[PDB]
Amino acid sequence: IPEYVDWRQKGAVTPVKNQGSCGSCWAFSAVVTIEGIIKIRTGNLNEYSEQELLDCDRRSYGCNGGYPWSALQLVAQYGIHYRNTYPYEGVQRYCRSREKGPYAAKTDGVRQVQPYNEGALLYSIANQPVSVVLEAAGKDFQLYRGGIFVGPCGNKVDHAVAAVGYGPNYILIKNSWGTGWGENGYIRIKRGTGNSYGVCGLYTSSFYPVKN
Ligand SMILES: [Cl-]
DSSP: OOSOEETTTTTOOOOOOBOTTSSOHHHHHHHHHHHHHHHHHHSOOOOBOHHHHHHHOTTSOGGGOOOHHHHHHHHHHTOBOBTTTSOOOSSOOOOOGGGGOSOSBOOOEEEEEOTTOHHHHHHHHHHSOEEEEEOOOSHHHHHOOSSEEOOSOOSOOOEEEEEEEEETTEEEEEOSBOTTSTBTTEEEEEOOOSOTTOGGGTTSOEEEEEOO
16 A cells, blocks of 8 residues: 555545534535545546435434444435535435435445454555544544644544545544634544554544445
8 A cells, every 4th residue: 555645636535614513424424435436436526415415314313413334325325416406504404315306426335444453444545535433522632733643532432534545654534624623624643553443533433435
């Protein structure tokens, strides 16, 4: 695998968003991976709808929270519309996918990374952006501005984000808290400690879509 990865430099990452007060991190996580795989597979970089997942993933709980893997399964079975055709309203509503015309994109499956395994996650990121989870409730994570973050933070994960790259001592993470948080919306999380959870629980639960 390469020494350095950054899918932004391949034009596979859309601008940073802000989820607001809604508990929709799981949908923003999933869309990052969708935007990435469609660019890698088709050549187009486009913004897809987090609201559609919020409204239509019957296995999640709207603004109470949810699962990136179930969002990705829904996109594998049905598809997803463009974000501008189905914009973010910040509250759950009824599923309006049928009123939006044919889907803009569709994947063919979902895969899971074996947990607590830094190298398995690195291998997946080299192929495409990966949905991951972490503990974001600590003040240190909330006040982060740049550099390689070593914590403090525990492993009680609570927040889905996306890994869009890595380097020798870090993994590169795109958050959905606006550009005003972190390194222009991003954080470099330290890798290579002697902790099997990863720092901030980073290796707890990672998934990615597949698209023939
Ligand atoms: Cl280091």
